[PDB]
Symmetry: C2
Subunit: 114 residues, 2 copies
């Protein structure tokens, strides 16, 4: 797919499964329209988030909603999560991989553009 995610759990040392990922597109109204959405598989990946034809030039926001991801461990009482906002295909057509690393208090998102 043009837009892929790869989430890692730093506390368990393994891909993060079931972490909800939400994507948005900034409409010309300066407003964030809902775009895609899924939940990581046992490999911290989401398959078929969007299509090459659906993912067009635009500002996107990838939110790693982890509010309760560490609920069973009794770890993050401050309910942390993060966003990444990049400009997708302001020069041809490409592929993006938003690689994230999760910890109760720290978030790490790297975009591998290719």
């Amino acid at each position: 797919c043009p837009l892929m995610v790869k989430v890692l759990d730093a506390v368990r040392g393994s891909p993060a499964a079931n972490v909800a990922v939400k994507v948005f597109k900034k409409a010309a109204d300066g407003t964030w329209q809902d775009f895609a959405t899924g939940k990581t598989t046992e490999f911290g990946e989401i398959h078929e988030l969007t299509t090459e034809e659906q993912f067009v030039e635009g500002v996107y926001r990838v939110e790693f909603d982890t509010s309760s991801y560490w609920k069973g461990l009794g770890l993050s009482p401050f309910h942390e999560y993060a966003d990444v906002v990049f400009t997708a295909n302001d020069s041809g057509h490409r592929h993006y991989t938003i690689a994230a690393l999760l910890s109760p208090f720290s978030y790490s998102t790297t975009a591998v553009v290719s």
Copy 2:
């Protein structure tokens, strides 16, 4: 102050100066109301963002943002900006320090609560 920022430049290896920081508070309407704002100093810090009395129990969203911050090294542009959304004081009162580490394609944000 109750809410402090500490921005580091991973490509230059020094505190990040002049990176815009925008804070938001989630109103009961589920909407983000502008809260505070500034630009990091030569120490990657913002002084007197908000006051102990102004920073109340609520959901905040800190957004770091840059403007051709890497222009000078001759690297590649990639409009990327990140957000952190934590829930403040859901018991008592505290001091938060949102430490961020910038790179052209990667963002690390760590919240030190104390």
